[PDB]
Every structure is written in C-alpha cells, then in structure tokens.
Amino acid sequence: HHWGYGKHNGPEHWHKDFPIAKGERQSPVDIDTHTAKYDPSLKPLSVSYDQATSLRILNNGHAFNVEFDDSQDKAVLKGGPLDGTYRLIQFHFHWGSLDGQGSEHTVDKKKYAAELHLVHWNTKYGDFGKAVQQPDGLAVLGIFLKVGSAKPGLQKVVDVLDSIKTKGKSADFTNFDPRGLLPESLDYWTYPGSLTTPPLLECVTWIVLKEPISVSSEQVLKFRKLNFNGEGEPEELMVDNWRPAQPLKNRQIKASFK
Numbered sequence: 001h002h003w004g005y006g007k008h009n010g011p012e013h014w015h016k017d018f019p020i021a022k023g024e025r026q027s028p029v030d031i032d033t034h035t036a037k038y039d040p041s042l043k044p045l046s047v048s049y050d051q052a053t054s055l056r057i058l059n060n061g062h063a064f065n066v067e068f069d070d071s072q073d074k075a076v077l078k079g080g081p082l083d084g085t086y087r088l089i090q091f092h093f094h095w096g097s098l099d100g101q102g103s104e105h106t107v108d109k110k111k112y113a114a115e116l117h118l119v120h121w122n123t124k125y126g127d128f129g130k131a132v133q134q135p136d137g138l139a140v141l142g143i144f145l146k147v148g149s150a151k152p153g154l155q156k157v158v159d160v161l162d163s164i165k166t167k168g169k170s171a172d173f174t175n176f177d178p179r180g181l182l183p184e185s186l187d188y189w190t191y192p193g194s195l196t197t198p199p200l201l202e203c204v205t206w207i208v209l210k211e212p213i214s215v216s217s218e219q220v221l222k223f224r225k226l227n228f229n230g231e232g233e234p235e236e237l238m239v240d241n242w243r244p245a246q247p248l249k250n251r252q253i254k255a256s257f258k
C-alpha cells in the first residue's frame, strides 16, 4: 500500500512511486564538517517567532506535526542563505527507536536522537502549494536533538502526545512558542535539498543548526509511544521515521562559521 518506514514500504521502496527519490538534490545528507565550506558571505539567520500562532498537533501516521497559522508573516525566517521571507507552517520530528539514531542529517556520520524540522515556505509564492513547485520554495530549519537534560520548551508538546497516539488524531495546540526549541547559537550549515519524505520534492534550502538542543530520555521516550497505525488497527510504534543519508552528488555544504 502507501509509503512508510517499514521493511516493505520504507525509504528503499520510495523510488517506485516517487522516482525523484533518486534525484540530484535529495535529503538528508551527511554533513562532512571538513569538506563544508565556510562562506563569509552568509548572513546570520533571522528567526522572528515572537508572533507565532500554533493551531494544533496531529499524528499523520508518519510523525506528529505542530501546525501554525501561516496566513500572515507571524513567524518567519529570513537572512542566512535565504532570499525573501519564509513563513513557518509546521514543525515535526524524526526520531529513532534508540537514542543513537533518529536524525535524518548526520554530522560526520554521527546520528542524533531526533531531528526537529521547522518547515517554512517562501512567501513570494503566495501559498505552500505553489512553494513546493519551486527550487527555493521551502526552507527547513533542522535542529538536532541530543539526549541529556530536559528542554522545558518541549514539555508542552510531550504532554499532549497522549491525545494524538494514533494516525488521524489531532488536538488543539495553541499558544505554543517555538522559540523554546531553539539552541543558543544560530550557526548553521546550508545546502540545497529536498523533503525527506515522499513526495521528496527538491524545493528545500536546508539550514541545519550546528548546535543541538538537549531533551531528556523521558521526553524522547514519549515520542516513541506514538503509533503509525490508526485506532482499531494493530499497534505499530512510531519510531525510526527517518530517511537515511542520500548522496551529496554535485552539491556543496556551506557553513556560516569556521
């Protein structure tokens, strides 16, 4: 049937329905810190999430997404390697069944426990749908989650997970402040890539933050209690919803720091 992360419908099978899976700018990729080029022309990232309006959290059977009201420039991303303003539409995570895996991007082959993707679309394209039809339509801010001390800002998300256990469930999730998920530094690596899940569109300018945020094992453990399946179906734990690193091909990863 449809795509997933199972043995039968996982990443290795995606190309059959989405041939772009074998494209030229697929993500995630391995960030080789020594081959990444420091580009002093990269401006600092400008993350303005003060007016962020979260709406709800939903388990879509692939991960849980926290959606935001993107009808106006409420929460945006500018600067960095970006031209124009990008609106935050949603954030979701990719995590593993074990702490040593879960991130999609890896740094020098190192896998983190999870990876937060703050999805933004280029406002010059009017709506999200048109942005996914453009080479610079999306900007995903990726933040690695390292298991260590709890991230207070993530707790609100962790607490609501019980109400969206299965595929299709959703819960109101207003007044959540995404700034609480940002690491201290905004140093980053950037390269042109794609969505890491089908349709695997190559519309993303990836901005992967150098600095991971810490989450407690208890916090990550609650991610793992989610289900890929819908209610009434056999229980399949939502874990390892990550795509392996893809070939960098003809691309250079630029770093905003040296």
Ligand SMILES: COc1cccc(N2C(CN3CCOCC3)=Cc3cc(S(N)(=O)=O)sc3S2(=O)=O)c1
Pocket: 060, 065, 089, 090, 117, 119, 128, 132, 140, 194, 195, 196, 197, 198, 199
């Ligand atoms: C407009 O809201 C949503 C909700 C959940 C996923 C997605 N989008 C879909 C599924 N989507 C269907 C419509 O055409 C584009 C791809 C997959 C997907 C994967 C993303 S990721 N892992 O590369 O950051 S981001 C993202 S997404 O673009 O936000 C969009």
Ligand SMILES: [Hg+2]
Pocket: 131, 132, 133, 134, 135, 136, 137, 201, 202, 203, 204
């Ligand atoms: Hg595209």
Ligand SMILES: [Zn+2]
Pocket: 092, 093, 094, 117, 196
């Ligand atoms: Zn993602």
